Write a protein that binds this ligand. Structure first.
Ligand SMILES: O=C(O)C(=O)Cc1ccc(O)cc1
Ligand SMILES: [Cl-]
Length: 360
């Protein structure tokens, strides 16, 4: 029944349009702890292609075939909702690697590593209101992720002095946004917020600049990898982008709790995969293990791996262990706050000379 190993199942997106998010998540697993408390970690990684059906199947294989103590994933919101559904039914701790709406139905067994949308929205809107932005347009996905961002722009953003003059949506698989851009450019808001991720985030970037949009463009943390710059090229110049601090540990003070783990991950990842290969996404899987390094020893005091008692002790340890330092933030979860993050979890980036720079 009980085991020596601690069993962790991970479903991420390493094929399909979101592969650029999952590949680094999987690769970061080379750099995480092999053991916690003397107990070897048995880590089982699967691709879900970003599909909720595959992520549901993967999560179930972990909780039932592997008897996992913890499950992690996925890379994008729709499959992450699916994993949460499974985790909460099976009563297994779930560490999400994409923001998701953490409803009362999902909250008991799920926490999230990515910064919550309102923290990222605030940093972007604050900048807007320092840069003479009065009117704003939105272009984002026609699904839960695009909704969370739009709703935040409407609730938080408007309350900061923004007037929404245009709202357009597109689906993840689309390779053109020409019609939506036509309306947006026509409305000529002072700024446009793009609610998308990966290669799709670069699409409105290029397409708006080539249509002659001159306003400020703002990107979510779903865009925070070099892939965006790769894909957007010269059109990325001057973008403002919400990011976790892992994108610039060098720019942090030594007093920042996030600095050490950011330097650790980035040194390791960039030694194998090359300079400036750091990402938002690699950091979420890395940080999930930093959380495990705090909560697993607590659980090990009172429960044996491979048992429900251990899963329950992990659940309780997630909310008893405070100020968990990781590359993307300092986490303090509660029964009700399943993200656990504050201002230490974000910085604002721009692109100059084809590289990300921290906006001071
Ligand atoms: O595309 C989606 O659904 C996402 O959830 C993307 C995403 C993933 C991780 C982040 O830290 C921020 C955004
Ligand atoms: Cl810690």
């Amino acid at each position: 029944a009980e085991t020596n190993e601690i069993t962790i199942g991970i479903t991420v997106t390493t094929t399909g349009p979101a592969a650029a998010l999952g590949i680094p998540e999987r690769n970061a697993l080379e750099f995480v702890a092999k053991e916690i408390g003397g107990h070897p970690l048995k880590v089982i990684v699967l691709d879900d292609g970003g599909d909720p059906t595959a992520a549901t199947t993967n999560a179930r294989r972990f909780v039932t075939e592997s008897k996992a103590d913890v499950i992690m994933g996925s890379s994008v919101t729709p499959p992450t909702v699916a994993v949460s559904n499974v985790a909460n039914e099976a009563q297994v701790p779930h560490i999400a690697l994409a923001p998701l709406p953490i409803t009362p139905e999902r909250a008991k067994w799920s926490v999230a590593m990515p910064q919550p949308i309102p923290i990222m929205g605030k940093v972007l809107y604050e900048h807007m209101k320092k840069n003479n932005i009065k009117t704003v347009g939105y272009i984002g996905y026609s699904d839960s992720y695009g909704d969370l961002w739009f709703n935040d722009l409407k609730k938080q953003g408007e309350a900061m002095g923004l007037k929404i003059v245009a709202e357009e949506r597109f689906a993840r698989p689309d390779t053109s946004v020409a019609g939506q851009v036509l309306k947006l450019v026509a409305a000529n808001p002072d700024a446009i917020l793009v609610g998308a991720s990966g290669t799709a985030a670069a699409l409105p970037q290029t397409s708006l600049r080539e249509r002659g949009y001159k306003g400020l463009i703002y990107q979510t943390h779903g865009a925070a990898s070099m892939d965006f710059i790769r894909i957007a090229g010269k059109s990325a110049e001057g973008v403002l982008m919400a990011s976790g601090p892992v994108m610039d540990p060098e720019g942090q003070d030594d007093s920042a709790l996030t600095k050490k783990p950011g330097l650790e991950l980035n040194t390791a990842y960039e030694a194998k995969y090359g300079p400036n290969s750091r990402s938002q996404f690699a950091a979420h899987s890395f940080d999930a293990f930093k959380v495990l390094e705090r909560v697993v020893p607590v659980a090990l005091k009172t429960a044996k791996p491979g048992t429900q008692e251990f899963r329950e002790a992990i659940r309780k340890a997630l909310v008893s262990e405070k100020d968990i330092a990781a590359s993307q933030g300092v986490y303090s979860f509660t029964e009700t706050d399943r993200y656990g993050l504050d201002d230490r979890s974000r910085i604002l980036l721009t692109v100059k000379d084809g590289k990300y720079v921290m906006v001071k």
